[PDB]
Design a protein around this ligand. Sequence first.
Ligand code: SF4
Length: 224
Amino acid sequence: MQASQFSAQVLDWYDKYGRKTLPWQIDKTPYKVWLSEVMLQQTQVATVIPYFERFMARFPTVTDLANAPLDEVLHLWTGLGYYARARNLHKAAQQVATLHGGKFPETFEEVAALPGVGRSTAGAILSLSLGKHFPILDGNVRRVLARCYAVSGWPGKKEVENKLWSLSEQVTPAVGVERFNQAMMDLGAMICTRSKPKCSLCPLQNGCIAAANNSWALYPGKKP
Ligand code: SF4
């Protein structure tokens, strides 16, 4: 599917069927998007929403989080699992207070330098909260791209990962980047699922190679 048709059909879908009312989409800031991205890395949206609300009520700004005791942060995280995320969350808050005056940094390199934030989470923060022109590549996005363009191979191998990032870059637009990047997460979460994807509900079904061959189970590849 040509890249301009990909982006236009995903944006047209999002306008009518996308999720726009999550709490970290209302009156968005870099801090709210970073906190939600870290909570969502390994947890389902319905479980995260009450934790996100409790964290924003107790820590309205990144400086408030930075100045709190780590034990208090770990107490409020209880139930989300994967506590290395919480330890790195507190460290990143401290890095923003210490190096950046309490204001979230707006360049790719400074965001990626934060503990617990890698290439995709950094692109997510800057595209979704400020409209900067970066693509993402979490597991939801990787599954949609690997099926639509038939990318076999384990994404654990560097050359396959590199191919998926080039494909993401190619289809991600500048105009509407915040809508597009959220829509790709929505598609992978709710429609292009690991098992038995709902292709009839997908705006890529007219150009997707996996749908044409009923071969979604091949993409992405599994570890050998
Ligand atoms: S048409 Fe089906 S396999 Fe292809 S991207 Fe959409 S849900 Fe995934």
